[PDB]
A paper describes a structure:
The Hbl toxin is a three-component haemolytic complex produced by [name] sensu lato strains and implicated as a cause of diarrhoea in [name] food poisoning. The toxin is composed of three components HblB, [name] and HblL2, all of which are essential for activity with no individual or pair wise activity. A crystal structure of the HblB component was published in 2008 and all components are predicted to share a similar fold, characteristic of the alpha pore-forming toxins (α‑PFTs), also related to the Nhe toxins of [name] (another 3-part toxin), the HlyE toxin from Escherichia coli and the App6 pesticidal protein from B. thuringiensis (known as Cry6 prior to a recent nomenclature revision). Although it has been reported that all components are able to bind to erythrocytes independently, more recent work strongly suggests that only the HblB component is able to bind and, thereby, to carry out a rate limiting priming step to allow lysis by the L components.
Here, we describe the expression of the recombinant [name] component and the elucidation of its structure to 1.36 Å. The electron density map showed continuous density for residues 41 to 404 (accession EEM59260.1) of the protein sequence. The overall fold comprises two almost parallel helical domains. Domain 1 is a bundle of five helices covering residues G41 to Q210 and R315 to K404. Domain 2 is a pair of two-helix bundles with an interleaving two strand β-sheet, covering the middle stretch of the sequence from residues A211 to D314. The points where the chain transitions between the two domains (residues 209–212 and 313–316) show some of the highest b factor scores in the structure and may represent hinge regions through which the two domains could move apart, although in the present structure they are in a closed conformation. Domain 2 in the head region also features the only beta hairpin in the structure, which is a typical feature of this class of protein, forming a hydrophobic beta tongue that has been shown in HlyE to undergo extensive structural rearrangement to contribute to the pore. In [name], however, this hydrophobic region is more extensive than in the other Hbl proteins, is rich in glycine and alanine residues and contains a central proline (Pro268) residue. No super structure or macro cluster of [name] is likely to exist in solution as a biological entity. In the computed complex, the beta tongue region of [name] is buried against the tail region of HblB; the β-tongue of HblB does not play a part in the dimer interaction.
Numbering used by the authors: 42 to 406
The structure:
Amino acid sequence: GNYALGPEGLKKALAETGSHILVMDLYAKTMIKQPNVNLSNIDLGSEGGELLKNIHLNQELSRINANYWLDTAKPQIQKTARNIVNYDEQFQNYYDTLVETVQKKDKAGLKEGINDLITTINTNSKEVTDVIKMLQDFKGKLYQNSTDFKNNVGGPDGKGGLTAILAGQQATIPQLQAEIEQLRSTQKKHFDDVLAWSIGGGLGAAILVIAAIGGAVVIVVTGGTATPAVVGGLSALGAAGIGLGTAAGVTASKHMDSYNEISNKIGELSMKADRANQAVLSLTNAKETLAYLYQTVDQAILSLTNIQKQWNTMGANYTDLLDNIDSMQDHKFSLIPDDLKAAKESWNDIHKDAEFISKDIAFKQ
């Protein structure tokens, strides 16, 4: 067209943002359900007793950070999506007036309408900057809690901390720690592969997958270790028209089943372990999740930075129209409705999916 008045790359950025919200919700809920590590009636010496006291303080702060995600940080990301919905409602409500001002050759009227939309675009861009600052602050708190916990569990380098005291008592502990770390990194890759398939299908498909997974998540606590699983995997998507039965859908289903397979295995390791080995499992599990949490907020910051870039690009595109209207000859002026109509359709197309991202994913209560 002559003027690009549509949502630009907002669809792709929303799909990524929705995927990060799901992952943060899972990790936060898992952290909240994991209890303080039980090493009662195990002689750890004074060194180990101090490390255990510090670990319990770290675990209490992990649960505070998880609740901050759920109650404070997430709603600010959801407002970013609500602002997309509200821009569509403003655009749809201005549309007939903007078309009328073209038909009446009313340049002042059209310019005032476009200026009002620019005002909203600029407000939306400024609001994302504030959300990114809030997330950067939160990332700093997640990184501090992660590194404090890692140091109390394993020292700076994995050669120390409470795990080395327990490994001094039981020679099988290092192999157990390594097994958990491997299972958790394999499992995260499987979940990332499911998310890759859901994003690859477009925002519409992404929202159906997010709803199906969120609605099916259960958190199981075994031997003091909390582990998520997705009941029935991707089963609920079989009639969703997103290609679950395609080769790529079958691969995504297999990854979800492998994710659940690893949750089962971690529970099995915990069931068979004594108290000390259960502590190695639970602390190692938590260590991995606390690092994944700050990594996922970093990803969320990147996706909101992209949303900010899209609002800024859109503000430039509308300002180009605004600046050109006064000198524009009648023929080009009469074509502006092509750009309005194209934008009407693209904005309406993003509304329901933005609305979804603006509201909690429905997990079990």
